[PDB]
Design a protein around this ligand. Structure first.
Ligand SMILES: *[C@@H]1O[C@H](CO)[C@@H](O[C@@H]2O[C@H](CO)[C@@H](O[C@@H]3O[C@H](CO)[C@@H](O)[C@H](O)[C@@H]3O)[C@H](O)[C@H]2NC(C)=O)[C@H](O)[C@H]1NC(C)=O
Ligand SMILES: *[C@@H]1O[C@H](CO)[C@@H](O[C@@H]2O[C@H](CO)[C@@H](O[C@@H]3O[C@H](CO)[C@@H](O)[C@H](O)[C@@H]3O)[C@H](O)[C@H]2NC(C)=O)[C@H](O)[C@H]1NC(C)=O
Ligand SMILES: *[C@@H]1O[C@H](CO)[C@@H](O[C@@H]2O[C@H](CO)[C@@H](O[C@@H]3O[C@H](CO)[C@@H](O)[C@H](O)[C@@H]3O)[C@H](O)[C@H]2NC(C)=O)[C@H](O)[C@H]1NC(C)=O
Ligand SMILES: *[C@@H]1O[C@H](CO)[C@@H](O)[C@H](O)[C@H]1NC(C)=O
Ligand SMILES: *[C@@H]1O[C@H](CO)[C@@H](O)[C@H](O)[C@H]1NC(C)=O
Ligand SMILES: *[C@@H]1O[C@H](CO)[C@@H](O)[C@H](O)[C@H]1NC(C)=O
Ligand SMILES: *[C@@H]1O[C@H](CO)[C@@H](O)[C@H](O)[C@H]1NC(C)=O
Ligand SMILES: *[C@@H]1O[C@H](CO)[C@@H](O)[C@H](O)[C@H]1NC(C)=O
Ligand SMILES: *[C@@H]1O[C@H](CO)[C@@H](O)[C@H](O)[C@H]1NC(C)=O
Lengths: 318, 169, 169, 318, 169, 318
């Protein structure tokens, strides 16, 4: 009579690694590194905007592309590669910092700054910002002299942020193709635009000169921005070449922004994103994208790390 | 037509548990699984599993841009930082899995030994080790007696005389 | 009025040591602690403690400002770097403690087994295991004999005849 | 007769975690994560300065608030929130880099730069820097024309660092409220200030313009700084709107700076600080402040991690 | 002129292997090494060695300058990041080596026990443990018999009668 | 009769550390932390250039020191401390970013930009760039008026990158010692240089003024650079004080750059470098240099960490 103690085993053994062995077979193992990607932006439960052709910075200045998003609200903001912050050629100064701010803003609330002008044109428009006909940035005013080559009067406009949150303020400096064109618009003489706050001080001069044609135009409007503290004031002293703001921006709350090239899905629910889609996983690691954002498993170099979920597999003696 | 326990081989027929009993007597051969030892092992393994499922509440946001590349100097600092951190988590992941796997294997072998040592203590002086993980029982042990060992109801005092006689001569 | 050793329970009365002896004879019941095994365990545990007390000589200075917030871009890079590093040390801390604790527990069980196996080897063929961590001694063992086991001065040759006779019949 | 082997146990069991179990009871455990804070700055053994109302950058230029610290020496430097680098409204360019430098300077040693002037006023003062009466920065000179609207002569002043350590040099550009006020002080014409070294080259222009009133004033003085290498020279060529330095700064040695809002204690001895106090601990980790500085335990998310200092607790069968 | 096995001492004369046999009989004293157990241990240790030789394919390039020092703010951010990462790898290295060493030592002790337990199972009821890692054999065991134990060809049934007689009286 | 089981041991025991013990002796141990340095740059298999006196940025502009490297090609680029990017005193703007770019360029391929000039001198030379006689940067043109104090005509020069890779473009602004010297060279009046692209817009003004003499000269030429996208164009509108480029640069492929002060060896083969030499090791860690680059073992604080390669050493009882 005999009794034997034993343990189970399989012919279906899977190899894992240990401190000592490499490729030791165990009965059962599971994967710890996620590679399974969902090629969509899972937006269920999250208020989502797909800016598309509207650049994120364009939501503040307001080219035609961003007219739908001038006061948008969101939990999840999606940037698209075709997006543009610009109609009339130019670029923001400190653009990326500003993007990072707007990505977690939860959207923007606009407020009129209440500037009034005299002895001056404000209907500055261009063929590049076509909205029905030739137009301009929706939140901005392109100031001219009055007739042509006429003198542009020195002005001083101020604005106080009477709210409890910081105010996003944006103005533009216009760079003409020539001093001839600059004179034709704002009159002769050197042009200066000074911007004063109570924790900010800067100065701006136009740089007229020939540049490659973008959208058929050689002129450039480069935007600048600051955050105005509550009860603090901004002052704009200028005499031409100035792109004045009409409204200020206020951040709504909290959000998250991503860059993607894949469609949206309001049925799938996710919390970790990358440009190629959404990562939904209980696994601690992933090998899809190092730049994934949101709440994500850690990125690793290895495509696979098997965790033994069973004992060492020792085949039966036949 | 002999049977063998652990020590050089497992049982591909044991399909209702991780650890088990295999006997042969006059009634024939039988194989049954032990619940307590199997469950102990499963609870420990899943205990590891839940530990690695604990998600992070740390949210990270974009620090650069893949449409409009940021400034070179700060961009290269960012890339160098990310790569440096990626090197760390890859190492950690490699080490964590390698370490856990070594422990999973060892605790499994441990449970085998505990079960073996338990049965050895049940049989007292009524059996001898054959060296293949089995016990040569020096008395008649029917299917009912075999079941008494599996559910820890075997009273060695009952068979002690019969066994020692056969053992000694 | 029986006594039991390790294997399903510890002793809340053992208050002068970590591991110990419990006997019952004609003189009654007694409980004494083993120094060498208890000290071995304590030395190993404090060995871990000193290891985690080793301070760092790495000095770090301020990299940002909580009165006057730095520039957004470099500030967000800093925060992202710190958060990334905080994630790492939190993981390390979690793993280190979990790992050390698993080892502390195991080495403690190991010391128990070493002590048990030692006593088993002292008694030779003069005792049998009852399966509750105790040894049924098959001869008369007074308090003086019990003390001889605890200080490793038990000579099995002295009681061998008496014990084997009782064991065999 | 019987002898049993055993181990101790308690009813006072404390739960810890392992690789497998969560909440397994052990006999004894200790904490590894420090949360016990000392709400003071432990300064025993360390030469300590509490700048208070004096901003750290103010120790170089010398508003009234920092007159006690113009040549201070320290092992531990403490910044306070009420501190200000400024009397007459303005701000430093590259301020934070400069702060980080001074925090580990061990203090500053000032040295006269020996500038002499002719055909020009140097007693430029303001109501904002009241010291007995109206005054100015202690280490700086506010240069004017001579009478009013008078022409400010082009000047060129140089200074060699004859020492073995780099020299901290600081100058200021004055931004008037109007071109009218700029003319009244430094005369008409465009104003230029150039600063030349042998590894540094920059240029500076004033930006007169309306700004919000700070301390009742709309004028701004923004400071600039460089480090002068041994035996190297700085040259200041200018014609107005220039805030000239009177003395240069030299770093004394080595120190550590903190920002705090809690009192100092010269009895307690520490080596790890944060704004809320001092962390004294042999524990490897802490959960008080991620931005703690000095020699500190590592910061972790978790408030508690118990390390087993005893065996597994198994209760006695009654 | 006695011999002793493991348990309080190793053998400085065992120079052809890690684990081995030492016997004394009528023919005298002898010492031989066991291949399978020694090789098992060596394979496991070198298994660790190869694991730490696995190089990284991650290439890093310069992020600052030691001829012309970069800007203070970004330079201090870089230094703070590097120092932070250096702190991490130093910790990892310290922990990895400490952890591996604890395991190397333990697996070595494990191999010793497996070898001891194997021989104990070979001798069956024909020998007794002396408590110094040795087996007192209760029959005549010439050099040829000793060799039979070392190559696992010892048949206990052959010497069973002779041994039990000497053991019992 | 008796048989005993045992394990080997030595008197040659070496101490290591564990989780519990510190200094526990084992039979055999090996080192995991590399400290063995090779004080040479192991360049076998790698195409290597030792720029020596040529600064890396000088390979683009072309002082005499870099004439051998104007179109160099490499796998491994070595910077030397004596290297200089400059003959006529000055410095690059965003120098370090540009260095980091060239270090992994694999070298540069130059291409003529094809600028032609009229009513203007181009043979601007200096004593500081002596090449046989007085000369100038090899890839640049120092533009003057024509005779002396003569008016410098407004010009506009453009260049398209007709290739598939970005073009490295470099221009210089000249800063004269005085407005007198600036007038003598480029004529009177304020000078402006504007640089226009299709993703870049900047402006540049000279800053004449006294500066310390470097190489006997008080004048400064500070260089600026941009990357021109394929099919995109740069435009240079200017009227003096302009250092024009003659050729553009294109990156060859891929490389790695190091800074070192030790000789080169074409026999030794390495992949991890620092200023003090090469690290060749299979060890996972090193304690030589934290700033080592290439494919390297990780840097650690500790000089030694012994890994047990044998069992615990227990001495024989005599
Ligand atoms: C081999 O290992 C794998 C991994 O441990 C085992 O698969 C696992 O099986 C369990 C139960 O069948 C799954 O648990 C599940 O959890 C989810 C979420 O809590 C629940 O909704 C399900 O109803 C189920 O209870 C577990 O997810 C699953 N693992 C994976 C990765 O899917 C498998 O059983 C092992 N092989 C053998 C023969 O046991
Ligand atoms: C439960 O675990 C704790 C932690 O190990 C034990 O408390 C510890 O007790 C020892 C000795 O009583 C303390 O050592 C001390 O070290 C300091 C500094 O070297 C010295 O000045 C003291 O005189 C003392 O020797 C140790 O600090 C202390 N742990 C803590 C965190 O304070 C405790 O003993 C354990 N429980 C039982 C019942 O043993
Ligand atoms: C003490 O530990 C050290 C480290 O494990 C042992 O030295 C090692 O010996 C082996 C074989 O003698 C060496 O392997 C070699 O590998 C290279 C590359 O694959 C090959 O070209 C050689 O021909 C050789 O096979 C190993 O490198 C060497 N370790 C070091 C760091 O050099 C040593 O044997 C141990 N002591 C004893 C007594 O065994
Ligand atoms: C708001 O601004 C006014 C002046 O514009 C100032 O006097 C006041 O202190 C500020 N704060 C509040 C709370 O009114
Ligand atoms: C950062 O890394 C990505 C990954 O390939 C690379 O494409 C990008 O050029 C890097 N950033 C910079 C500024 O070089
Ligand atoms: C850095 O993190 C702190 C922690 O809350 C946050 O308050 C601060 O705004 C962050 N810095 C920037 C520049 O956003
Ligand atoms: C100091 O400066 C002078 C000129 O000002 C220069 O000739 C000399 O080389 C410099 N160094 C020393 C050590 O004198
Ligand atoms: C970076 O660390 C090195 C190491 O000593 C130091 O010499 C250097 O000054 C640091 N960088 C800055 C910008 O302080
Ligand atoms: C090249 O440039 C021309 C104008 O200079 C433009 O029309 C064209 O779209 C560009 N791209 C290609 C591929 O020709």
């Amino acid at each position: 009579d005999k009794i034997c103690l034993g343990h189970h085993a399989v012919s279906n053994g899977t190899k894992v690694n240990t401190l000592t062995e490499r490729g030791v077979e165990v009965v059962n193992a599971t994967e710890t590194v996620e590679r399974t990607n969902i090629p969509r932006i899972c937006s269920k439960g999250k208020r989502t905007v797909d800016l598309g052709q509207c650049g994120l910075l364009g939501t503040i200045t307001g080219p035609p592309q961003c007219d739908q998003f001038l006061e948008f609200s969101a939990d999840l903001i999606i940037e698209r590669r075709e997006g543009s912050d610009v109609c009339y050629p130019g670029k923001f100064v400190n653009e990326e910092a500003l993007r990072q701010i707007l990505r977690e803003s939860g959207g923007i609330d606009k407020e009129a700054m209440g500037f009034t002008y005299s002895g001056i044109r404000t209907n500055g428009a261009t063929s590049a910002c076509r909205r029905s006909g030739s137009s301009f940035y929706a939140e901005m005013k392109w100031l001219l002299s009055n007739t042509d080559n006429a003198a542009f009067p020195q002005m001083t406009k101020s604005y106080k942020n009477t709210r409890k949150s910081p105010a996003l303020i944006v103005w533009g400096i216009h760079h003409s193709v020539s001093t001839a064109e600059q004179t034709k618009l704002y009159g002769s003489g050197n042009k200066l635009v000074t911007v004063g706050s109570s924790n900010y001080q800067q100065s701006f001069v136009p740089s007229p000169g020939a540049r490659p044609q973008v959208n058929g135009l050689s002129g450039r409007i480069d935007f600048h921005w600051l955050m105005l503290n509550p009860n603090d004031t901004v002052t704009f002293s200028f005499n031409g070449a100035f792109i004045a703001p009409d409204r200020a921006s206020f951040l709504r709350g909290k959000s998250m922004g991503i860059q993607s090239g894949v469609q949206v899905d309001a049925n799938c629910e996710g919390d970790c994103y990358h440009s190629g889609g959404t990562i939904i996983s209980n696994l601690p690691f992933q090998n899809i994208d190092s730049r994934a954002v949101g709440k994500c498993p850690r990125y690793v170099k290895q495509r696979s790390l098997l965790l033994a979920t069973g004992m060492k597999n020792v085949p039966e003696i036949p | 037509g002999a049977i063998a326990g652990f020590i050089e081989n497992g049982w591909e027929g044991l399909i209702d548990g991780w650890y088990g009993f295999r006997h042969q007597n006059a009634q024939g051969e039988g194989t049954a699984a032990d619940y307590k030892s199997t469950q102990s092992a499963i609870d420990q393994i899943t205990g590891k599993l839940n530990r690695l499922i604990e998600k992070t509440n740390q949210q990270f946001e974009l620090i650069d841009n893949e449409f409009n590349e940021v400034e070179k100097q700060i961009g290269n600092v960012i890339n160098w930082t990310r790569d440096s951190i990626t090197e760390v988590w890859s190492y950690n992941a490699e080490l964590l899995v390698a370490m856990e796997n070594q422990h999973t294997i060892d605790l499994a072998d441990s449970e085998m030994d505990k079960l073996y040592e338990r049965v050895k203590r049940q049989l007292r002086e009524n059996a001898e080790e054959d060296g293949t993980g089995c016990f040569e029982i020096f008395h008649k042990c029917d299917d009912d007696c075999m079941a008494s060992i599996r559910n820890n109801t075997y009273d060695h005092s009952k068979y002690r005389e019969e066994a020692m006689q056969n053992r000694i001569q």
